Design a protein around this ligand. Sequence first.
Ligand SMILES: *[C@@](O)(CO)[C@H](C[C@@H]1CCNC1=O)NC(=O)[C@H](CC(C)C)NC(=O)c1cc2c(OC)cccc2[nH]1
Ligand SMILES: *[C@@](O)(CO)[C@H](C[C@@H]1CCNC1=O)NC(=O)[C@H](CC(C)C)NC(=O)c1cc2c(OC)cccc2[nH]1
Lengths: 305, 303
Amino acid sequence: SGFRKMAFPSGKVEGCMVQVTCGTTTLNGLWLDDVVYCPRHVICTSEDMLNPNYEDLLIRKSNHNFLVQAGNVQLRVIGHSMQNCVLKLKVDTANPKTPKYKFVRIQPGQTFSVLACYNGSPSGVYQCAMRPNFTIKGSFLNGSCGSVGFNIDYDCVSFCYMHHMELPTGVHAGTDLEGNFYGPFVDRQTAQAAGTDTTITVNVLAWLYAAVINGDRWFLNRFTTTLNDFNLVAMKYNYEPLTQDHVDILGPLSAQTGIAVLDMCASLKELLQNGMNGRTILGSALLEDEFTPFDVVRQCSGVTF
Amino acid sequence: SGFRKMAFPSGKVEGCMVQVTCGTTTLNGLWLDDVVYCPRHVICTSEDMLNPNYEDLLIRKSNHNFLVQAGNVQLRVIGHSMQNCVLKLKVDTANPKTPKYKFVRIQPGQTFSVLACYNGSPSGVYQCAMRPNFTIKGSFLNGSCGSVGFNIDYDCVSFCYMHHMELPTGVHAGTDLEGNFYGPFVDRQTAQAAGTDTTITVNVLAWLYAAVINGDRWFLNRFTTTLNDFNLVAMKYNYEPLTQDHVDILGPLSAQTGIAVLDMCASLKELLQNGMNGRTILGSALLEDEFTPFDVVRQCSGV
Ligand SMILES: *[C@@](O)(CO)[C@H](C[C@@H]1CCNC1=O)NC(=O)[C@H](CC(C)C)NC(=O)c1cc2c(OC)cccc2[nH]1
Ligand SMILES: *[C@@](O)(CO)[C@H](C[C@@H]1CCNC1=O)NC(=O)[C@H](CC(C)C)NC(=O)c1cc2c(OC)cccc2[nH]1
């Protein structure tokens, strides 16, 4: 028993982290097969990052201008190309520790493990959830760019995040492994503000299913609702609307408890309108929204990779 | 910026996790050099676990009674010994992934990373704290025994915990790598209660400093308190006493924020007496006590 924020075992990703340096600018890169992926602003000087023209700045660079190191061992760069905001550097060595992997673009509310790295050395791992405003409430210091977020199913690692930016509010923004930013942010040295955030409804519902599984079910009422009616009410409380995919991924938890998805939506709707009334759920008076239905099943069922 | 429950990278430990089976009892083992460490109750049947005379059950076991599997390869046990509640299985093959390691016993209030495993396969990693009553609030299911907790310094893994049991209240208990339990627990199949838990005061203060470093200051106040007057109120709320060593350890966080430790103590006193209302600190509605001063320093230095 017990419910904690659980990250994936990071060994498969640790063996792929390297350091990329251009001049004095250094950050982290991801070494898969014979290609190293990293943020493209590594080619920028400190003054360049204010208003960079990555097309013009990359024209002046050659393969021999890139320092890629696995620890202290240099990997000779034999080719370079740019894809959106990520740099792809071909190296002369195929990473023997390359795991079965895939590049995926996650949705808001989806969670992933972040392997915080500095100078190509992994330092920590923790769970993050993509907020509806396309930010993540992470923990990043100087030199953390290049750090990746990932999910692991069976023996396959699904990379979904590469770190780029810290907003003035202390939250963080990045791209997928194809260089496309999550949200409307750009890789420039400017103060960028994110939209107003909302609560991840599908994850709150998953957290309620988790409580029911553990015998905590006072909040179950005899009401039901339509998906459209619930979505309209939920937005009034700064809650995200549910998609068809959200209803589907809640299927297993619904079948395990015998509580239909729309019935639990009606239960959640009551909690939003009348409040919690001095009671708690799973020991907390706050509704938790950073546990996905998979996170609840994976933790309540001990799945392995 | 930002502050999160952060664990060490588990790669160095993943390369040491194996599966140990004896009869129909299966759990996790830790493979270091040519030795496999696992909880000794693996030699017990379901009926043996009720009242096990481990010295008796062990002498009746043979090397071939232990099935050790490392991935898809079976390791041959060429020797077996017992150190307290930890079984030591000597194998004929040395683990090539064995990192630089040490076995240490953690103190209450200290944190460590847990690599939860099932059937010898790593499943998840998270950070725990050794509660003053020598329990931990983890996430363990059936088959989690054998899972270890650890810290990493440079390239050295310091193993400090191996999981054994879950109390009726939902918290968990285990031993160090020498087989000695943390707390007054025994590896028998009985419902066991822990001592009254207290709050790790030095950790709460460090976490309040992390909140100030990240822009949370609503709980601060202009008042100050003496160390003894703070401890009087703290003990009243089942908080652990704050020593001068704790005050010294919080020094770096005090210098970075410019808030004296005894000033933060006055803030915590007000929080304990008045509560938090509906407000939150670092997204939490409760006072967090599982972050050590060094945990805060590592994440908020230079911010
Ligand atoms: C990477 O390590 C850079 O390689 C670094 C990561 C942040 C540093 C501190 N914590 C982090 O997560 N990223 C940056 O410094 C980026 C560089 C961009 C992508 C070119 N810049 C920011 O994150 C940034 C710039 C500014 C700013 O300007 C002016 C004003 C306010 C906030 C801000 N954040
Ligand atoms: C191991 O996986 C067993 O190898 C298991 C880990 C717990 C299982 C559930 N969640 C866990 O962390 N440990 C146990 O099952 C141990 C067995 C040995 C002999 C210590 N037992 C318990 O944890 C346990 C037994 C009892 C009990 O009896 C009667 C009554 C109430 C609680 C309880 N916990």
